[PDB]
Amino acid sequence: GQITAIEDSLSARNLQMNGVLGRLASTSQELAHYHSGEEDGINMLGAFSLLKVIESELQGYLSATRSRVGRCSALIQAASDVQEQGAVDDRDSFLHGVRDLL
Amino acid sequence: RMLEVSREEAERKRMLDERANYRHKQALLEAYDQQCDEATRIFAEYHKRLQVYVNQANDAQRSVNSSNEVLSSLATVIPASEVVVDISNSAKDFIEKEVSAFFQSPDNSLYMLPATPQGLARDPSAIPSICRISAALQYPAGLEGS
Numbered sequence: 001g002q003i004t005a006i007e008d009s010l011s012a013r014n015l016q017m018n019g020v021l022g023r024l025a026s027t028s029q030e031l032a033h034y035h036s037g038e039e040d041g042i043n044m045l046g047a048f049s050l051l052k053v054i055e056s057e058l059q060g061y062l063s064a065t066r067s068r069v070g071r072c073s074a075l076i077q078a079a080s081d082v083q084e085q086g087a088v089d090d091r092d093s094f095l096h097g098v099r100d101l102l
Numbered sequence: 103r104m105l106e107v108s109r110e111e112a113e114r115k116r117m118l119d120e121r122a123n124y125r126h127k128q129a130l131l132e133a134y135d136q137q138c139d140e141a142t143r144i145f146a147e148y149h150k151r152l153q154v155y156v157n158q159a160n161d162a163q164r165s166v167n168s169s170n171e172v173l174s175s176l177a178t179v180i181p182a183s184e185v186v187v188d189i190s191n192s193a194k195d196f197i198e199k200e201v202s203a204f205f206q207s208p209d210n211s212l213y214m215l216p217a218t219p220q221g222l223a224r225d226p227s228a229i230p231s232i233c234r235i236s237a238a239l240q241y242p243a244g245l246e247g248s
Contacts, residue, residue: 014200026164032182033167037174046148047181054188060136061195074213077223088233
């Protein structure tokens with residue numbers, strides 16, 4: 001139940017950042033421009049300060065992709081409990097080895 | 103009268119050992135939400151406009167700066183070319199996070215359930231709860247558990 005709720009917030013944030021994948025270049029020079037006119041008539045704060053966060057954002061992103069190594073850690077419990085029947089019967093096949101004592 | 107089935111035991115490891123450390127998964131979910139939060143962190147003060155550039159400022163605020171904010175201008179070049187591509191990298195790392203989170207966010211929260219039955223999780227040690235304590239546990243999985 002809580003697995004879908006977080007994914008719903010993820011999917012919502014995934015679908016409301018749909019355009020930003022190709023619309024994030026708007027700040028490449030507007031961040032520069034929307035200071036340029038005012039200072040030189042006769043915005044850098046967001047540009048400078050955010051550079052610190054990206055390193056923290058990257059590290060947070062690092063854990064997002066580092067967990068992809070652990071992507072096969074949880075769902076296997078239900079999967080391993082069924083697909084391993086070849087070895088499951090094998091361990092109980094030596095059980096059958098005991099019974100046919102002749 | 104072998105009517106005992108240890109599938110409860112296989113789930114006894116599963117039923118509530120997840121809640122005994124219910125906050126292990128939330129630490130990882132914080133890490134998964136960190137990229138969401140850090141993207142929200144970098145979309146806070148100046149990229150607050152991006153929350154409405156996606157909807158309303160799409161065709162207005164992008165192009166006015168390229169002329170008006172430089173016609174008024176002609177100390178405004180250095181940090182824009184360094185952070186925005188990193189922000190664009192964040193968006194690139196966000197859609198791939200979302201693809202990952204569509205297949206990883208369930209993992210960390212679920213994996214606390216097999217915390218105690220990590221043997222049942224791992225391949226080389228699920229057999230005991232599928233073969234060894236299973237001569238009655240395999241009754242519900244009668245076709246599987248021969």
